[PDB]
Scaffold this active site. Structure first.
Site, mmCIF file in Angstrom:
data_model
loop_
_atom_site.group_PDB
_atom_site.id
_atom_site.type_symbol
_atom_site.label_atom_id
_atom_site.label_comp_id
_atom_site.label_asym_id
_atom_site.label_seq_id
_atom_site.Cartn_x
_atom_site.Cartn_y
_atom_site.Cartn_z
ATOM 1 N N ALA A 26 112.561 -88.769 35.685
ATOM 2 C CA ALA A 26 112.728 -90.227 35.492
ATOM 3 C C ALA A 26 114.185 -90.638 35.731
ATOM 4 O O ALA A 26 114.434 -91.681 36.392
ATOM 5 C CB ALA A 26 112.239 -90.619 34.121
ATOM 6 N N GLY B 269 112.622 -85.647 30.822
ATOM 7 C CA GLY B 269 113.166 -86.941 31.268
ATOM 8 C C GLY B 269 113.995 -86.853 32.542
ATOM 9 O O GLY B 269 114.517 -87.899 32.978
ATOM 10 N N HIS B 270 114.187 -85.663 33.120
ATOM 11 C CA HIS B 270 115.096 -85.513 34.283
ATOM 12 C C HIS B 270 114.519 -86.193 35.531
ATOM 13 O O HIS B 270 115.306 -86.801 36.300
ATOM 14 C CB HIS B 270 115.430 -84.047 34.530
ATOM 15 C CG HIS B 270 116.129 -83.445 33.364
ATOM 16 N ND1 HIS B 270 117.286 -83.987 32.836
ATOM 17 C CD2 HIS B 270 115.839 -82.353 32.635
ATOM 18 C CE1 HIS B 270 117.668 -83.246 31.809
ATOM 19 N NE2 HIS B 270 116.793 -82.229 31.672
ATOM 20 N N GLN C 283 111.313 -79.284 33.199
ATOM 21 C CA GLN C 283 110.262 -80.321 33.363
ATOM 22 C C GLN C 283 109.913 -80.935 31.997
ATOM 23 O O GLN C 283 110.076 -80.262 30.955
ATOM 24 C CB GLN C 283 109.021 -79.747 34.037
ATOM 25 C CG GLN C 283 109.206 -79.506 35.523
ATOM 26 C CD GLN C 283 107.961 -78.953 36.179
ATOM 27 O OE1 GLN C 283 106.886 -78.900 35.565
ATOM 28 N NE2 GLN C 283 108.096 -78.546 37.436
ATOM 29 N N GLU D 222 106.128 -90.285 50.838
ATOM 30 C CA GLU D 222 105.474 -89.737 52.054
ATOM 31 C C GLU D 222 103.968 -89.532 51.821
ATOM 32 O O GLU D 222 103.168 -89.976 52.661
ATOM 33 C CB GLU D 222 106.165 -88.437 52.468
ATOM 34 C CG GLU D 222 105.603 -87.857 53.750
ATOM 35 C CD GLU D 222 106.301 -86.612 54.269
ATOM 36 O OE1 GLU D 222 107.475 -86.400 53.922
ATOM 37 O OE2 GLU D 222 105.657 -85.857 55.031
HETATM 38 C C1 LIG Z 1 104.881 -86.999 45.800
HETATM 39 C C2 LIG Z 1 106.113 -86.881 46.651
HETATM 40 C C3 LIG Z 1 106.734 -88.236 46.890
HETATM 41 C C4 LIG Z 1 107.136 -86.014 45.984
HETATM 42 O O1 LIG Z 1 108.195 -86.484 45.694
HETATM 43 S S1 LIG Z 1 106.722 -84.324 45.716
HETATM 44 C C5 LIG Z 1 105.505 -84.336 44.379
HETATM 45 C C6 LIG Z 1 106.139 -84.381 43.015
HETATM 46 N N1 LIG Z 1 106.662 -83.073 42.641
HETATM 47 C C7 LIG Z 1 105.935 -82.103 42.092
HETATM 48 O O2 LIG Z 1 104.762 -82.274 41.766
HETATM 49 C C8 LIG Z 1 106.634 -80.789 41.834
HETATM 50 C C9 LIG Z 1 106.405 -80.249 40.420
HETATM 51 N N2 LIG Z 1 106.696 -81.231 39.391
HETATM 52 C C10 LIG Z 1 107.923 -81.690 39.177
HETATM 53 O O3 LIG Z 1 108.875 -81.390 39.899
HETATM 54 C C11 LIG Z 1 108.124 -82.647 38.025
HETATM 55 O O4 LIG Z 1 107.231 -82.294 36.969
HETATM 56 C C12 LIG Z 1 107.956 -84.123 38.406
HETATM 57 C C13 LIG Z 1 106.540 -84.396 38.927
HETATM 58 C C14 LIG Z 1 108.992 -84.495 39.484
HETATM 59 C C15 LIG Z 1 108.160 -84.989 37.169
HETATM 60 O O5 LIG Z 1 109.496 -84.766 36.686
HETATM 61 P P1 LIG Z 1 109.735 -84.453 35.132
HETATM 62 O O6 LIG Z 1 111.198 -84.278 34.923
HETATM 63 O O7 LIG Z 1 108.835 -83.362 34.677
HETATM 64 O O8 LIG Z 1 109.251 -85.819 34.454
HETATM 65 P P2 LIG Z 1 109.963 -86.631 33.276
HETATM 66 O O9 LIG Z 1 111.150 -87.399 33.690
HETATM 67 O O10 LIG Z 1 110.096 -85.704 32.102
HETATM 68 O O11 LIG Z 1 108.774 -87.675 32.981
HETATM 69 C C16 LIG Z 1 107.565 -87.175 32.386
HETATM 70 C C17 LIG Z 1 106.903 -88.320 31.658
HETATM 71 O O12 LIG Z 1 107.568 -88.480 30.380
HETATM 72 C C18 LIG Z 1 107.670 -89.843 30.045
HETATM 73 N N3 LIG Z 1 109.109 -90.171 29.893
HETATM 74 C C19 LIG Z 1 110.154 -89.826 30.731
HETATM 75 N N4 LIG Z 1 111.312 -90.286 30.312
HETATM 76 C C20 LIG Z 1 111.016 -90.973 29.139
HETATM 77 C C21 LIG Z 1 111.815 -91.691 28.228
HETATM 78 N N5 LIG Z 1 113.127 -91.853 28.368
HETATM 79 N N6 LIG Z 1 111.193 -92.273 27.171
HETATM 80 C C22 LIG Z 1 109.870 -92.111 27.039
HETATM 81 N N7 LIG Z 1 109.024 -91.448 27.823
HETATM 82 C C23 LIG Z 1 109.664 -90.904 28.874
HETATM 83 C C24 LIG Z 1 106.912 -90.605 31.134
HETATM 84 O O13 LIG Z 1 105.557 -90.798 30.783
HETATM 85 C C25 LIG Z 1 107.040 -89.675 32.342
HETATM 86 O O14 LIG Z 1 106.037 -89.922 33.335
HETATM 87 P P3 LIG Z 1 105.201 -88.694 34.062
HETATM 88 O O15 LIG Z 1 106.182 -87.718 34.704
HETATM 89 O O16 LIG Z 1 104.429 -89.438 35.121
HETATM 90 O O17 LIG Z 1 104.249 -87.991 33.114
#
Ligand SMILES: CC(C)C(=O)SCCNC(=O)CCNC(=O)[C@H](O)C(C)(C)COP(=O)(O)OP(=O)(O)OC[C@H]1O[C@@H](n2cnc3c(N)ncnc32)[C@H](O)[C@@H]1OP(=O)(O)O
EC number: 2.3.1.48
Lengths: 322, 15
Positions: free
Chosen positions: A235, A232-233, A229, A257
């Protein structure tokens, strides 16, 4: 016996590991914990009847071949404590498939042949996180998989348990329904001069029917496993899913959903990244206020829903001003 | 279980 010591928080009692190497079994850094256990252990997220309760759910990194063990220092005796311990084993059995191993020797025997594990489905995207410092590079792939892929149905049963720990209202999907789509993230890694694949996370998307001849894919479940987590995965995954559906004229746009606050934040980040260089979102267009052509271009180019296009406008408008 | 097409049909947590 001090009975207070025989009530245990299941959010800390449940120990999850993703194992690539035998040493991962003894490395506490590899252990991660549920955010939610209320769907099995109630609103209080407690199990009664054990002192030093440990619920071990260890997974081989790719295949997610499972070890499940319940350990404890002591438990209540119905003859002297006059109550029976909670059926922790039975509760966990409700949400993992049968056929798990029950000891680390059998688990390590399965790890020996993990090189045979291959990703399911069609490769959509490959990306690397390259060191800026002359250090290690990491390489990831995203696949679209379905129940025609050999081994996928059984793998998905092992994987879906993780949703119960990390999505507040997770429920298991009906995989007999052909409208379910599955997007998988793997990390490539080397072991003993071979190339293997580690599960990073996934998304399920329902290809919702829009009468008479369209669909509106609905993001249902999305999980990047804890160790991956904030890297960037998520995204990359949501961008790859938008790019996938962009090739289908019958797709209107993509929704979700019951989206979480964390999902909304990620979606805003991804959709702003996709829209920022579109002509309809230029500074001079933004300074004249929201125009429908912004939603039209966002829908046509990236299957972005009109509600989401308005949010992209608001965020980009804030970005071009002080 | 959720209804047709649903993957978030579970109970909310109430602390
Ligand atoms: C709501 C329904 C539809 C669902 O799909 S289920 C609910 C979502 N899932 C969960 O809450 C389960 C637990 N959490 C997770 O699985 C994950 O933390 C997650 C919510 C899917 C987010 O995925 P992650 O891989 O951790 O996120 P990342 O791609 O690293 O992005 C993190 C942030 O970094 C930043 N970011 C990402 N990529 C970049 C790049 N390339 N440059 C700069 N900044 C970046 C940006 O602000 C992203 O936005 P937020 O996630 O909103 O803070």
């Amino acid at each position: 016996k001090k009975l207070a010591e025989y009530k245990c928080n299941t959010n800390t009692a449940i120990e999850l590991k993703l194992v690539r190497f035998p040493e991962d079994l003894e490395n506490d850094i590899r252990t991660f914990f549920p955010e939610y256990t209320h769907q099995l252990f109630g609103d209080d997220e407690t199990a009664f009847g054990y002192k030093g309760l440990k619920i071990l759910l260890y997974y081989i990194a790719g295949s997610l071949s499972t070890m499940f063990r319940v350990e404890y220092a002591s438990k209540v005796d119905e003859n002297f404590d006059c109550v029976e311990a909670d059926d922790v084993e039975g509760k966990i059995r409700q949400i993992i498939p049968p056929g798990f191993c029950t000891n680390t020797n059998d688990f390590l025997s399965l790890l020996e042949k993990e090189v045979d594990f291959k990703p399911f489905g069609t490769l959509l995207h490959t990306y690397s996180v390259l060191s800026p410092t002359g250090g290690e590079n990491f390489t990831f792939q995203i696949y679209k998989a379905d129940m025609t892929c050999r081994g996928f149905r059984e793998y998905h049963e092992r994987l879906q348990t993780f949703l119960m720990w990390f999505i507040e209202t997770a429920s298991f999907i009906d995989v007999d329904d052909e409208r379910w789509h599955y997007f998988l993230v793997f990390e490539k890694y080397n072991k003993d001069g071979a190339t293997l694949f580690a599960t990073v996370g996934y998304m399920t998307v329902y290809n919702y029917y829009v009468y008479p001849d369209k669909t509106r894919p609905r993001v249902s479940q999305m999980l990047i496993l804890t160790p991956f987590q904030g890297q960037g995965h998520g995204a990359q995954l949501l961008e790859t899913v938008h790019r996938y559906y962009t090739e289908f004229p019958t797709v209107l746009d993509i929704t979700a959903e019951d989206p979480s606050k964390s999902y909304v934040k990620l979606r805003d980040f991804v959709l702003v990244k996709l829209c920022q260089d579109l002509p309809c979102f230029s500074r001079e267009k933004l300074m004249q206020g929201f125009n429908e052509d912004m939603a039209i271009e966002a829908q046509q180019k990236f299957k972005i829903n009109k509600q989401h296009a308005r949010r992209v406008y608001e965020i980009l408008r804030l970005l071009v001003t002080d | 279980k959720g209804g047709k097409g649903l993957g978030a049909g579970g109970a909310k947590r109430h602390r």
